[PDB]
Design a binder for this molecule. Structure first.
Ligand SMILES: [Cl-]
Length: 274
């Protein structure tokens, strides 16, 4: 009963996003976990802990607590959902460490389990995340095939991940210079983003637009970064500005390319500063 209180309190503080309090409460719940019964109430506990750690990008701690929950959840065949989610945490942490090959292995396992258990949304989530790793690994053909499979499911369900999947799909096709097919996913995603009031992807589509689908309207890229930066989305600013910087480097536009490397530096500094 005592562990339960500290446990619930941790989830409670995480809800109001008091991260220090949550982990603080979890730290004692874990001590009073000495008197724990079922292997899966522990697993439930470890999962939550890995999650708050994943939120604070404490990559080492998150992946530790995730694996401990995972190694238990795998057995109990009634807990496929929990198993898949644990694997997402592991793979998300691996993504944060730029271990995209290892993260792909995780997500591939997730897809198998999501399949043999017919969890439709987890199937699309695996496909999407697989496609994202592939994009990072620059295997764009496979990235696209996994992304449309995700798209088929999300379009039916109208889940929020629809926008992000269309965005990633658009970008992947643009990187292969498949500008005509990309423009189709661009208009479709840009529309879904606008009508869902997804201001974040609206700004992100504007970056693709300035990059690929206007006549070189670079101010669109700029204004979109202004929007993102104003929203304190510095990870997005850091990652996207590097992609933009790389692209201009490949074109031989060194001045523009430098401007965006500089911006990524600043965004990184803002992340360390909190
Ligand atoms: Cl094309």
């Amino acid at each position: 009963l005592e562990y339960y209180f500290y446990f619930f309190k941790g989830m409670y503080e995480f809800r109001r996003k008091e991260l220090i309090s949550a982990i603080s409460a979890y730290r004692i719940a874990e001590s009073k976990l000495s008197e724990v019964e079922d292997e899966i109430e522990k697993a439930e506990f470890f999962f939550k802990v890995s999650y708050v750690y994943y939120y604070m990008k404490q990559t080492y701690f998150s992946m530790n607590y995730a694996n401990r929950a995972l190694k238990i959840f795998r057995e109990y065949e009634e807990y496929a959902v929990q198993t898949v989610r644990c694997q997402f945490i592991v793979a998300g942490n691996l993504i944060d460490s730029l271990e995209y090959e290892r993260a792909l292995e995780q997500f591939l396992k997730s897809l198998e389990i999501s399949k043999e258990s017919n969890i439709e949304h987890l199937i699309a989530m695996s496909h999407m995340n697989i496609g994202i790793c592939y994009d990072e690994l620059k295997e764009y053909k496979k990235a696209s095939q996994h992304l449309i499979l995700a798209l088929e499911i999300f379009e039916k369900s109208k889940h929020s991940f629809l926008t992000k999947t269309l965005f990633t799909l658009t970008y992947v096709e643009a990187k292969q210079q498949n500008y005509n097919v990309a423009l189709i996913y661009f208009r479709k995603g840009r529309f879904i983003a606008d009508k869902s009031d997804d201001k974040e992807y609206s700004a992100k589509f504007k970056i693709l637009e300035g990059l690929f689908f206007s006549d070189g309207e670079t101010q669109l890229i700029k204004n979109a970064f202004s929007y993102l930066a104003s929203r304190k989305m510095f990870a997005d600013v850091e990652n996207f500005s590097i992609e933009v910087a790389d692209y201009f480097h490949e074109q031989g536009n060194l001045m523009l390319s430098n401007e965006y490397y500089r911006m990524s530096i600043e965004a990184r500094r803002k992340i360390k500063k909190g």
